[PDB]
Amino acid sequence: LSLTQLSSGNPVYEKYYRQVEAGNTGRVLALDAAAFLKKSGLPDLILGKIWDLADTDGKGVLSKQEFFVALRLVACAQNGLEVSLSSLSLAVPPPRFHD
Secondary structure, three states: OOHHHHOOOOOHHHHHHHHHOOOOOOOOOOHHHHHHHHOOOOOHHHHHHHHHHHOOOOOOOOOOHHHHHHHHHHHHHOOOOOOOHHHOOOOOOOOOOOO
16 A cells, blocks of 8 residues: 555654655665664564565665555564565564654
């Protein structure tokens, strides 16, 4: 879906999506993303899967849903669930990231 359904269109996440964003253009270099993700708690291995499943647009840079996905996604492996979206859209627990 879209950010909307993602969380009734909660920009709260945008705050984070921008935290990783580098420069002053308004785009996530992605690289930084991995930085913010690593701030989760999960390993790089399990993470890799997230990114893999994340990356889709093409360019390293991240997007909306994309990033908004890998985010909650981390909360997936956080419970020991799958790392693919195929196992997403469930009642996964809360991540480690800040509130």
